[PDB]
Amino acid sequence: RPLNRLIQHALLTQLSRLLLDGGVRPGEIAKVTVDQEGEIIVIRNHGI
């Protein structure tokens, strides 16, 4: 049950923000990996 909550509060949080300003263009493969602080980071492709 808590597994569905961590996805919408970490994985689906940063990725949904880049789909509004211009981070992830509709047609680019996004990369999901970890950073240096132990958190699911979303590496953006294009800028604002």
Partner 1 sequence: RHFANEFINRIDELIVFNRLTPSNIRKIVDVRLKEVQERLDEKQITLDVDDKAKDLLAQQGFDPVYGA
- Interface residues with partner 1 (CB under 8 A) are 1, 5, 8
Taking the least distance from each CB to partner 1, the nearer of 11 and 43 is 11
Distance CA 17, CA 36 (A): 21
**φ, ψ for residue 40 (rounded to 5)?**
-70, 100
Taking the least distance from each CB to partner 1, the nearer of 1 and 29 is 1
Taking the least distance from each CB to partner 1, the nearer of 1 and 47 is 1
